[PDB]
């Protein structure tokens, strides 16, 4: 059980029609636990997972503090952005940020992240060593100079290796029953004739957590990586996930194909046969 | 715990 904590933030300017839209969410693994929305009436950081509600009014105040501050910083970042590339104040622009830390099973620091996108393209990110940034263009160069001059990294490195992961453990302990159990996929296969010369095998996986999953289709034991319709994994909307995989099969050959399923909630990987 | 962050 490797684990991750992530925050995502999006700010979208509305030239003319108000301040930027700002939306922030947090995740332990594929479970969202908190959200901020500037448009919502509550104007606080809000819970989205039963267990984070254990936290005191202290935590709510301070988290609201920070997400609020960040949203203001975004407002200015959007303004600065236009200035850097000389863009119209009439266009709508999007500003995104990811932050988090990864721990292994023992609970110890693996990885830390802090990266940004402007208009959906990489802008600036903290390198893996956590001591320098990677800047995607000349605008982001300027941002980087400031950040080195300001010695921002020394703070981020420490925060990630220190407080981020400490926060990760504590959430994992608190939201135990939920975050630490792993739900396995209920699997099955369906058959859908489409002509007199061909039929469709579709392999399902349902009710699984976490979202990480591999569906693979074989013929005679030979991989079929090329001839396989695969859907992007998708949430049930009850905290589980779903995926499926499909192959067009020459009528009479259904028995030549097998379906393979890997998921860390399965002791053994599965072979499914029609 | 949400991050502290800095101006571009």
């Amino acid at each position: 059980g490797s684990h991750s904590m992530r925050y995502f933030s999006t700010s979208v300017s509305r030239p003319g029609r108000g301040e930027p839209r700002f939306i922030a969410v947090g995740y332990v693994d594929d479970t969202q636990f908190v959200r901020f929305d500037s448009d919502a009436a509550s104007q606080r950081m809000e819970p989205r997972a039963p267990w984070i509600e254990q936290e005191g009014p202290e935590y709510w105040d301070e988290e609201t503090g920070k997400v609020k501050a960040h949203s203001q910083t975004d407002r200015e970042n959007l303004r600065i952005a236009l200035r850097y590339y000389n863009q119209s104040e009439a266009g709508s622009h999007t500003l995104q940020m990811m932050f988090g830390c990864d721990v292994g099973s023992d609970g110890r620091f693996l990885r830390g992240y802090h990266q940004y996108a402007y208009d959906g393209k990489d802008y600036i990110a903290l390198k893996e060593d956590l001591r320098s940034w990677t800047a995607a263009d000349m605008a982001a160069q300027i941002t980087k100079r400031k950040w080195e001059a300001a010695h921002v990294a020394e703070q981020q490195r420490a925060y990630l290796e220190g407080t981020c992961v400490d926060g990760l453990r504590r959430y994992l302990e608190n939201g135990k029953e939920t975050l630490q159990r792993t739900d396995p996929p209920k699997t099955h296969m369906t058959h859908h004739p489409i002509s007199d010369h061909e039929a469709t095998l579709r392999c399902w996986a349902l009710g699984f957590y976490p979202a990480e999953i591999t569906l693979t289709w074989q013929r005679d034991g030979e991989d079929q990586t090329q001839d396989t319709e695969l859907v992007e994994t998708r949430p049930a909307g009850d905290g589980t996930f779903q995926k499926w995989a499909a192959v067009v099969v020459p009528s009479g050959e259904e028995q030549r194909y097998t379906c393979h399923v890997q998921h860390e909630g399965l002791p053994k990987p599965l072979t499914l046969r029609w | 715990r949400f991050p502290l962050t800095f101006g571009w």
């Binding site: 995502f8 999006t10 979208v12 939306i23 969410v25 995740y27 969202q32 959200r35 929305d37 989205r48 709508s92 999007t94 995104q96 996108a117 208009d119 959906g120 393209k121 990489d122 369906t190 859908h192 579709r202 349902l206 859907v231 992007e232 998708r234 949430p235 049930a236 909307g237 009850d238 779903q242 499926w244 | -």
Partner: protein, 99 residues
């Protein structure tokens, strides 16, 4: 700086007529974040449809889950309708028990 959404329309649990379920429309991998998403019952858009909070994958592209509590029948038609700048005309996608 431009990505068309992937649309998926599907139920939470395996569909059984007369049993209440949830109709879900998952949009994913799009950009920018402006998106309109409707759930239709026989072509008539269903009113109280909710959605997750805007988030995004590793690659910066966005995803949203829209859902409503519904009771399918073997008579009723259900669909997702979607628009986005990358779409010239709203996209209707029919819910298929099997996909």
């Amino acid at each position: 700086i431009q990505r068309t959404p992937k649309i998926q329309v599907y139920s939470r649990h395996p569909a059984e007529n007369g049993k209440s379920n949830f109709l879900n429309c998952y949009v994913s991998g799009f950009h920018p974040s402006d998106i309109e998403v409707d759930l239709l019952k026989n072509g008539e858009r269903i009113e109280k449809v909710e959605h997750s909070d805007l988030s995004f994958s590793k690659d910066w592209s966005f995803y949203l889950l829209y859902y409503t509590e519904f009771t399918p029948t073997e008579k009723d038609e259900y669909a997702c309708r979607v628009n986005h700048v990358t779409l010239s005309q709203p996209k209707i996608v029919k819910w298929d028990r099997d996909m």
